[PDB]
Design a protein around this motif. Sequence first.
Motif, short mmCIF file in Angstrom:
data_model
loop_
_atom_site.label_atom_id
_atom_site.label_comp_id
_atom_site.label_asym_id
_atom_site.label_seq_id
_atom_site.Cartn_x
_atom_site.Cartn_y
_atom_site.Cartn_z
N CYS A 73 -28.88 -20.67 4.40
CA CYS A 73 -28.64 -21.87 3.61
C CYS A 73 -29.92 -22.59 3.16
O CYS A 73 -29.85 -23.44 2.28
N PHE A 87 -24.08 -19.80 0.83
CA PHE A 87 -24.46 -20.36 2.11
C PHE A 87 -24.33 -21.88 2.14
O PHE A 87 -23.75 -22.44 3.07
N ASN A 188 -20.81 -12.47 6.04
CA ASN A 188 -20.64 -13.89 6.32
C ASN A 188 -19.27 -14.35 5.88
O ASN A 188 -18.81 -13.97 4.80
#
Length: 233
Positions: A73, A87, A188
């Motif tokens: 991120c 992210f 993710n």
Amino acid sequence: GIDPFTVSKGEELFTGVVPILVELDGDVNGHKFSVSGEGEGDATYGKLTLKFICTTGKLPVPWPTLVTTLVQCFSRYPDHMKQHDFFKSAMPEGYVQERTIFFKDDGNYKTRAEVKFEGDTLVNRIELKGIDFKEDGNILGHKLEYNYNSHNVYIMADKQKNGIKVNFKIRHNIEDGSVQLADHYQQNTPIGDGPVLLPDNHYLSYQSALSKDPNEKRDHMVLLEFVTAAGIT
Ligand code: NA
């Protein structure tokens, strides 16, 4: 879902300098250890500055082998690519990162990390499990140089999981001049149930510098990293 009066959400949470906390529990061939990390991320500049400490004593694997595991991120996404930043879009509720890392001619790490805000602090809580390593190999035998190369990290959408799939190869310098390859496979998934940004194919360009704190006597790693998204226009 989150309070719809949430003051800062998604990319809004990253416009300034953000404190980072990392906690990792690891077990590699039964060698157990923990690592804590602290520092700051400044996503506007793609900048990470962190110091990591082995809190259990001596780290039983080389520090460089933990770099990829130890908050994407904080990547700098160009304005024209902002719609591809998965992210940040998952924040503040966060995401789970899962990896398998295959060390060529040696063992593998499997990792699970939960990345989310706890107030102002961006927290990465990680479990790492390593098996099949050679006790006298490059990893458990500590034959890897304390340095790091630049790499590209390749990202694509995984619409089935409302997330992303990622792969890349790390080359760790061995003390004899050779190379220890570490093939990374990654996925993710958001923790929350709201919309996230599912990206076009692109990559992150990483630069990493490892150093030591001359006043620190615990086993540790200082890391300075710059990360920029690219590969679209
Ligand atoms: Na497209």
